[PDB]
A paper describes a structure:
Plasma gelsolin (pGSN) is the most abundant actin regulating protein in our plasma, and it’s major function is to scavenge F-actin released from the damaged or dying cells, thereby protecting microvasculature of our circulatory system. Detailed analysis brought forth that 28–161 has an inherent tendency to self-associate at temperatures around 30–45 °C and the association behavior is influenced by Ca2+ ions present in the buffer.
Of the different conditions tried, we could obtain diffractable crystals only at 18 °C and in the presence of Ca2+ ions. Any case, our crystal structure showed two Ca2+ ions bound to each chain of 28–161 and the G1 domains were arranged next to each other with few interactions stabilizing the interfacial contact. Importantly, during refinement, we could not identify any electron density corresponding to the g1-g2 linker, possibly due to inherent flexibility across these residues. The interaction analysis revealed that the dimer is stabilized by one classical hydrogen bond between K150 → Y87, a salt bridge between H29 → E21 and numerous weak non-bonded interactions. Alignment of Cα trace of one chain in our crystal structure with same residues in the crystal structure of Ca2+-activated N-terminal half bound to actin provided an RMSD value of 0.45 Å. This information support that Ca2+ ions are sufficient to induce changes in G1 domain to bind actin and no additional significant changes happens post-binding to actin. Comparison of the two states of dimer of 28–161, one seen from our crystal structure bound to Ca2+ ions and other model fitted inside SAXS data based envelope to represent Ca2+-free dimer state showed that the difference lies in the relative orientation of the g1-g2 linker. Of particular interest is the residue Ala146 which acts as a fulcrum of this differential positioning with almost 180° flip of the tail region after it.
Author numbering: 29 to 150
C-alpha cells in the first residue's frame, strides 16, 4: 500500500485497487482494465486554465465485489478527500452505471475482466 503523499501532485490519473482492506496501486499498463470482482479508487487530477489543480475522486465497484472491498474503497475516498482538504468531488461508480465523467477518462478501452482478488475474510 501507498500513502496519500503520492497523490494529486501532478495532472493525470492514479488508480489503486482494494486488496485485502488495502489500497494497492495498479500498474499503468493495466489502466482502463477493471476486474468485475473488485473495487477501485481513481483520482483525476486535471490542470486548470489558471494553472490550479482540480480533483475528481471516483470509487468504482465491481459487480462481483465483496462488501469489504466495497466498503474500503468508499472509506479511502473520504479519507483521501479529507487529505486533499476536501477539494475533490466524490463520485460513486457502479460497474455498468458509471458517469460520463468517469468514462471520458477511458476513450480507448474500458475493458472489464472476469474475477479479482478474493475478500479479506479468506
Ligand atoms: Ca474481490
Ligand atoms: Ca470534497
Amino acid at each position: 500500500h501507498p500513502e496519500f503523499l503520492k497523490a494529486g501532485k501532478e495532472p493525470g490519473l492514479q488508480i489503486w485497487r482494494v486488496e485485502k482492506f488495502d489500497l494497492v496501486p495498479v500498474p499503468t499498463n493495466l489502466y482502463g482494465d477493471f476486474f468485475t470482482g473488485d473495487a477501485y479508487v481513481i483520482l483525476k487530477t486535471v490542470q486548470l486554465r489558471n494553472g490550479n489543480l482540480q480533483y475528481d475522486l471516483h470509487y468504482w465497484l465491481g459487480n462481483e465485489c465483496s462488501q469489504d472491498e466495497s466498503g474500503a474503497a468508499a472509506i479511502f475516498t473520504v479519507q483521501l478527500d479529507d487529505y486533499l482538504n476536501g477539494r475533490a468531488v466524490q463520485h460513486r461508480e457502479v460497474q455498468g452505471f458509471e458517469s460520463a465523467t468517469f468514462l471520458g477518462y477511458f476513450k480507448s478501452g474500458l475493458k472489464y475482466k472476469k474475477g479479482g482478488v478474493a475478500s479479506g475474510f479468506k
